[PDB]
Subunit: 157 residues, 2 copies
C-alpha cells in the first residue's frame, strides 16, 4: 500500500516497507525499531498476530508511533511523473498536485468514453469524436456527428 512511483535516484532500502516493499506511506515505527506503512503493519497485526513481522517481537497497535522524520524525508524525494511522454521530475509531496494538471494524463471523452491524453482532448472532442453533438442546418436538431449523414438524407428539410 506504499507509494508505487519511480524514484530517481532510486529509493534506498531504509525507506522501503518490509511488508509491501514500497516507499513507506504514513510511516510508523515499532518499539523494536522497524518502520512500516501505517496500513501494512496494522493489517499485519490484525491478521498475522500482535508481533513485528520482521523479528516476531510482540507488538500492539497502540505501541506504534508516527515516524514523521521518515515521512518528511520520503515526501522530499525526487520522483518522475508516471504519465507517458512526461519528463517532469519533482518531490513526491508535489506529485499528486501535478497529476491533476499533467497534460499527459489519460482522460475519458465525455461523449464516447474512450481514453485520450489530456493535451489531445480538445481536438478529439471538437473535431474527431463520432459522438460529438452537431446541429442540423435545417431543423436545428442536435445529433451525434456519426449520425449526421443518415439524418441529412432523410431530414424534413
Amino acid at each position: 500500500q506504499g507509494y508505487d512511483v519511480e524514484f530517481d535516484p532510486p529509493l534506498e532500502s531504509k525507506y522501503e516497507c518490509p511488508i509491501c516493499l514500497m516507499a513507506l506511506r504514513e510511516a510508523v515505527q515499532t518499539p523494536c525499531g522497524h518502520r512500516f506503512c501505517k496500513a501494512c503493519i496494522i493489517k499485519s497485526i490484525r491478521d498475522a498476530g500482535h508481533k513485528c513481522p520482521v523479528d516476531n517481537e510482540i507488538l500492539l497497535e497502540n505501541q506504534l508511533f508516527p515516524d514523521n522524520f521518515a515521512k518528511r524525508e520520503i515526501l522530499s524525494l525526487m520522483v518522475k511523473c508516471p504519465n507517458e511522454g512526461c519528463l517532469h521530475k519533482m518531490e513526491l509531496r508535489h506529485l499528486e498536485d501535478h497529476q491533476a494538471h499533467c497534460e499527459f494524463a489519460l482522460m475519458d471523452c465525455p461523449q464516447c468514453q474512450r481514453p485520450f491524453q489530456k493535451f489531445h482532448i480538445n481536438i478529439h472532442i471538437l473535431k474527431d469524436c463520432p459522438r460529438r453533438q452537431v446541429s442540423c442546418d435545417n431543423c436545428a436538431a442536435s445529433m451525434a456527428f456519426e449520425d449526421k449523414e443518415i439524418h441529412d438524407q432523410n431530414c424534413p428539410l
Copy 2:
C-alpha cells in the same frame, strides 16, 4: 553529548543532533518529527522550555519516543578508532569494546603515573621507569630504581 567520533564515510546530517551537532546518542523523536539525543532534548525542555528547539512546537518530555530505528542505523556506521597510530575501522557499536583492548590507547604507569601507549607499557614498567621497584643484592631492601645508587652508599649491607 552525542557520539564524538570520526565516522568514515562522514556522518550524514540526518543522524546529527540539532542540539549538540553530533551523532544521535539514545535517539528519540518528537511529535513534530525531529530527532535528538535523549539527553540533549530533555535538557532543552528542562531549561529552554517545553518546546522543540527547531520549530518552537510545544513539546512535553512524555511525548518523546525512542527512535530505535535511528539508533540501530547509527550503531552500525563505520567509525575510525581515535587512538594515535591505530588504523582499525569498525561499526560504532563495537568501538567501546575495542578501546578497552586497543594497544594504542594511553595508560598511566602504576609507578610514576606518567602516560604511555599500551603497547609500550611493559617495556616502560620493567626497563625504563625511574620508580620501578628493585631489590638490593645485600639487604634485600626494595627501592625505586632511581634511588639505587644512593642506597648502595647507605646500607645495612
